[PDB]
Amino acid sequence: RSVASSKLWMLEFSAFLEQQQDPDTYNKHLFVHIGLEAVDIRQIYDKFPEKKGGLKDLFERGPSNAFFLVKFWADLNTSSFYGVSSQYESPENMIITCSTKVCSFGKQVVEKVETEYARYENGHYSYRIHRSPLCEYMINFIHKLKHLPEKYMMNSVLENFTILQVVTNRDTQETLLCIAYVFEVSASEHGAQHHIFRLVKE
Amino acid sequence: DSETDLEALFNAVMNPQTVPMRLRKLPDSFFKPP
Numbered sequence: 001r002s003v004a005s006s007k008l009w010m011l012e013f014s015a016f017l018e019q020q021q022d023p024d025t026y027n028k029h030l031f032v033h034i035g036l037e038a039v040d041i042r043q044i045y046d047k048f049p050e051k052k053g054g055l056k057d058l059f060e061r062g063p064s065n066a067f068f069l070v071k072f073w074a075d076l077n078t079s080s081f082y083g084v085s086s087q088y089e090s091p092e093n094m095i096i097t098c099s100t101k102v103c104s105f106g107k108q109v110v111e112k113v114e115t116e117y118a119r120y121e122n123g124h125y126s127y128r129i130h131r132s133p134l135c136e137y138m139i140n141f142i143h144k145l146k147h148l149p150e151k152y153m154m155n156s157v158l159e160n161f162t163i164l165q166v167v168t169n170r171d172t173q174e175t176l177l178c179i180a181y182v183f184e185v186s187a188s189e190h191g192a193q194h195h196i197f198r199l200v201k202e
Numbered sequence: 203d204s205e206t207d208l209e210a211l212f213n214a215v216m217n218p219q220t221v222p223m224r225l226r227k228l229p230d231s232f233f234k235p236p
């Protein structure tokens with residue numbers, strides 16, 4: 001129930017590499033996967049676009065209960081398909097728009113926009129972005145990270161890399177979820193790890 | 203061009219700005235995995 005406003009809950013998020021050995025055999029590797037401490041949002045403003053409709057403008061518009069910060073410890077240890085899959089629940093039947101902006105030094109480099117419709121499910125409604133192609137920039141970025149001899153060098157690069165995800169009701173233009181993503185490379189036994197935080201005004 | 207900037211970034215960290223995250227007011231769980 002962690003990444004959830006009062007109008008939308010992201011139950012699932014994953015980014016992955018799938019390889020097809022042969023027409024009947026598939027191998028999937030997860031870079032990150034999600035399946036409550038507060039953070040002052042003003043601490044991360046310089047890390048995202050701050051023009052009109054930027055993170056600040058979005059937060060001050062509200063609702064303040066839609067804003068989250070996720071820290072990922074990404075597992076980079078691995079006929080190719082690079083994908084992102086996410087699942088959402090809402091009490092309402094809506095047209096949702098999902099905007100994902102990749103940022104470097106707080107500047108947008110690439111945006112992907114997806115429009116999703118509801119499906120009735122046990123008295124509520126579900127939304128799914130299934131197997132969305134990971135854009136060229138991110139594939140190449142991942143490749144360049146992988147070729148670094150040292151893990152701390154990877155983290156140094158990621159210090160100025162952020163991803164901003166904004167889910168919006170297309171009709172009312174209400175922010176349903178806003179998720180700020182910060183990344184490090186995982187160095188553990190378990191593989192990919194994460195921690196979710198709520199963004200607050202103070 | 204962003205591909206040329208990317209290349210410069212990666213050559214930079216191999217052959218050695220703002221306030222880094224580790225110095226900011228963030229919880230400890232932000233920097234150490236579960």
Ligand SMILES: *C(=O)CCCCCCCCCCCCC
Pocket residue numbers: 015031032074084100102110111112133134135136138142163183
């Ligand atoms: C391009 O279309 C932008 C879409 C990017 C979606 C974000 C996927 C998250 C990538 C996590 C991999 C970890 C990289 C260090």
